[PDB]
């Protein structure tokens, strides 16, 4: 057909997240896909956070909670069961964000909830009380698709996260909702929010087809997932091993929290590691790139993080604040 509709049957985030990186770079951008999963106890980092000064790691062994890494920036993130989620992909010009949003509120009409966007990202009930959040997401843009996923809360635990993150003082010191579906609807599951995402997806497209179950136990049928899953559930990339050096510069924006480690020898820098939750890392990864071998001084932190500028317009005041806090903060 023009569909596809996967099911997965784990609760493995390391095996959802990689249907998800096949979904976004493996398969043809050329069917329309859905893909319903959720996950077990697990916080989701950003790709350039550093779990071992985010993380209560040892909390989160002892009460048995999964450390995934994903591919995109941000912050941490909690899952567990009753998040239920979601990833729709198809080939442009054809589709847009407002094709896979209409099919969830559509989704969560059938089910006798009046919901809404709000902002980019969030769908909301309206409330007595006011906005109640239900749903987040993200959306991204290739050259050949667009990709969008999300979750929507039916009865997650609210409170869990800040039990597995460690206190951040500058993040405390700067400064700069949300709701259970099973809060309106007592009795609903994971698989009802499916099979009504499902319709409303069979319903836009006109189309029919035959839900493909997918779990750890055989390759789904996307290439070259064996090695997507082998690379995604490894403990070097969730994980990595601590940052051992013997400065740190630290810092938190408006737009995120930046921590650069670095080592000095002969005034230069010998080497160098930048960590944030920013929701776009790359210019900061190609800062870190740039600093390796910089003379360790004000003129030249600034020439090489402004060199930059050029290739990321879109982060222009990211990279001028930057360039100012390491001028002031090295001296």
Same mark, same amino acid.
């Given at each position: 057909?023009?569909?596809?509709?996967?099911?997965?049957?784990?609760?493995?985030?390391?095996?959802?997240?990689?249907?998800?990186?096949? *979904?976004?770079?493996?398969?043809?951008?050329?069917?329309?896909?859905?893909? +319903?999963?959720?996950?077990?106890?697990?916080?989701? *980092?950003?790709? =350039?956070?550093?779990?071992?000064?985010?993380?209560?790691?040892?909390?989160?062994?002892?009460?048995?909670?999964?450390?995934?890494?994903?591919?995109?920036?941000?912050?941490?993130?909690?899952?567990?069961?009753?998040?239920?989620?979601?990833?729709?992909?198809?080939?442009?010009?054809?589709?847009?964000?407002?094709?896979?949003?209409?099919?969830?509120?559509?989704?969560?009409?059938? +089910?006798?909830?009046?919901?809404? $966007?709000?902002?980019?990202?969030?769908?909301?009930?309206?409330?007595? /009380?006011?906005?109640?959040?239900?749903?987040?997401?993200?959306?991204?843009?290739?050259?050949?698709?667009?990709?969008?996923?999300?979750?929507?809360?039916?009865?997650?635990?609210?409170?869990?996260?800040?039990?597995? +993150?460690?206190?951040?003082?500058?993040?405390?010191?700067?400064?700069?909702?949300?709701?259970?579906?099973?809060?309106?609807?007592?009795?609903?599951?994971?698989?009802?929010?499916?099979?009504? *995402?499902?319709?409303?997806?069979?319903?836009?497209?006109?189309?029919?087809? /035959?839900?493909? *179950?997918?779990?750890?136990?055989?390759?789904?049928?996307?290439?070259?997932? =064996?090695?997507?899953?082998?690379?995604?559930?490894?403990?070097?990339?969730?994980?990595?091993?601590?940052?051992?050096?013997?400065?740190?510069?630290?810092?938190?924006?408006?737009?995120?929290?930046?921590?650069?480690?670095?080592?000095?020898?002969?005034?230069?820098?010998?080497?160098?590691?930048?960590?944030?939750?920013?929701?776009?890392? $790359?210019?900061?990864?190609?800062?870190?790139?740039?600093?390796?071998?910089?003379?360790?001084?004000?003129?030249?932190?600034?020439?090489?993080?402004?060199?930059?500028?050029?290739?990321?317009?879109?982060?222009?005041?990211?990279?001028?604040?930057?360039?100012?806090?390491?001028?002031?903060?090295?001296?």
């Amino acid at each position: 057909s023009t569909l596809r509709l996967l099911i997965s049957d784990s609760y493995d985030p390391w095996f959802n997240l990689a249907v998800e990186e096949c *979904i976004f770079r493996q398969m043809p951008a050329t069917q329309r896909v859905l893909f +319903l999963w959720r996950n077990a106890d697990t916080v989701v *980092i950003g790709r =350039a956070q550093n779990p071992w000064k985010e993380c209560n790691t040892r909390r989160m062994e002892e009460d048995n909670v999964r450390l995934a890494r994903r591919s995109s920036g941000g912050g941490a993130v909690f899952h567990d069961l009753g998040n239920t989620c979601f990833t729709f992909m198809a080939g442009k010009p054809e589709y847009d964000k407002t094709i896979s949003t209409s099919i969830v509120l559509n989704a969560l009409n059938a +089910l006798g909830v009046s919901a809404e $966007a709000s902002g980019r990202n969030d769908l909301v009930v309206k409330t007595v /009380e006011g906005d109640r959040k239900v749903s987040g997401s993200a959306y991204r843009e290739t050259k050949d698709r667009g990709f969008h996923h999300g979750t929507l809360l039916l009865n997650a635990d609210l409170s869990r996260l800040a039990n597995y +993150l460690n206190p951040d003082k500058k993040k405390l010191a700067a400064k700069g909702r949300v709701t259970n579906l099973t809060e309106l609807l007592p009795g609903i599951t994971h698989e009802q929010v499916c099979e009504a *995402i499902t319709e409303a997806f069979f319903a836009h497209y006109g189309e029919r087809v /035959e839900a493909e *179950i997918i779990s750890p136990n055989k390759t789904p049928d996307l290439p070259n997932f =064996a090695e997507t899953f082998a690379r995604q559930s490894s403990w070097e990339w969730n994980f990595g091993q601590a940052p051992a050096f013997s400065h740190l510069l630290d810092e938190r924006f408006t737009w995120g929290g930046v921590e650069l480690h670095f080592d000095v020898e002969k005034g230069h820098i010998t080497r160098a590691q930048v960590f944030t939750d920013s929701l776009n890392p $790359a210019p900061l990864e190609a800062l870190a790139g740039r600093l390796q071998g910089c003379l360790y001084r004000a003129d030249m932190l600034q020439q090489e993080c402004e060199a930059l500028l050029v290739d990321f317009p879109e982060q222009e005041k990211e990279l001028r604040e930057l360039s100012a806090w390491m001028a002031g903060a090295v001296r």
